[PDB]
Design a protein around this ligand. Structure first.
Ligand SMILES: [Ca+2]
Lengths: 279, 5
């Protein structure tokens, strides 16, 4: 399948070179997989989700996304127009408030929740969790991410936007999950992206168009935007049977575009997520 | 510029 005039990030993950505008992908499109977006929530009623999104848990007064961040990230995973895996099932877990903040205890609870909840859902091709959030180092937060991964969920987390070594941030610094940095449309490391030996992979993160609240769209930037590209790619690859939750991060790194990025500090991987689609 | 870590 091909989507013409796609958002640049979708085109980038299906090409070996920058500058293209068509997103090429297998029609299976992640059908049969499930992705939990752990964030400010998801505006499930947005037409772009086609009834494939559902809120399953909130830690606040409402399950509504009053911020937009979660809806944007969810759109990059699996909306019709802006998504990588256009037929996946999305589940929203609201661990961040409408200002985009949240306590570590709540974020941990949300991870533990997904590890259990996935056992109540029909996701025959596998389960992914996308965490576009983080803060200063916490061994407890790292442990929660490690448990989630251990339970059989492909965990993708943002590296962070401090232009610093991600070793000092969580859950970015947990080695067992897939830690995602951001790149721009000219194949440079995004100016705000964290880096360091704990990164596993880069994905598009600057000027990413996706869904927003009130049935709208907008372009924003961050490692928060790169993370759902990788999460969606994992769901997509799982549905194709190329990899499993335990090994998807490694498979994505193995099959990545290598050496294409500029402004990567020595010691950080130069690997850009790539779907290897051949018609 | 954050949309985060
Ligand atoms: Ca890792």
């Amino acid at each position: 399948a091909a989507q013409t005039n796609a958002p640049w990030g979708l085109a980038r993950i299906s090409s070996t070179s920058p500058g293209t505008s068509t997103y090429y992908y297998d029609e299976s499109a992640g059908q049969g997989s499930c992705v939990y977006v752990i964030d400010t929530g998801i505006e499930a009623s947005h037409p772009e989700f086609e009834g494939r999104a559902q809120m399953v848990k909130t830690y606040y007064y409402s399950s509504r996304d009053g911020n937009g961040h979660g809806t944007h990230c969810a759109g990059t995973v699996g909306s019709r127009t802006y998504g990588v895996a256009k037929k996946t099932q999305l589940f929203g877990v609201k661990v961040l408030d409408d200002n985009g903040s949240g306590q570590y205890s709540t974020i941990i609870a949300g991870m533990d929740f997904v590890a259990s909840d996935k056992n109540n859902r029909n996701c025959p091709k596998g389960v992914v969790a996308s965490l576009s959030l983080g803060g200063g180092y916490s061994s407890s937060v790292n442990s929660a991410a490690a448990r989630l991964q251990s339970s059989g969920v492909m965990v993708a987390v943002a590296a962070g936007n401090n232009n610093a070594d991600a070793r000092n941030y969580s859950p970015a610094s947990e080695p067992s999950v897939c830690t995602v940095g951001a790149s721009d449309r000219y194949d440079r490391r995004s100016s705000f992206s964290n880096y360091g030996s704990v990164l596993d992979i880069f994905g598009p993160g600057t000027d990413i168009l996706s869904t927003w609240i009130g049935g709208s769209t907008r372009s924003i930037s961050g490692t928060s935007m790169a993370t759902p590209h990788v999460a969606g790619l994992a769901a997509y690859l799982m549905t194709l049977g190329k990899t499993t939750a335990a090994s998807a991060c490694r498979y994505i790194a193995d099959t990545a575009n290598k050496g294409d990025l500029s402004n990567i500090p020595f010691g950080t991987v130069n690997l850009l997520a790539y779907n290897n689609y051949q018609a | 510029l954050l949309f985060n870590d």
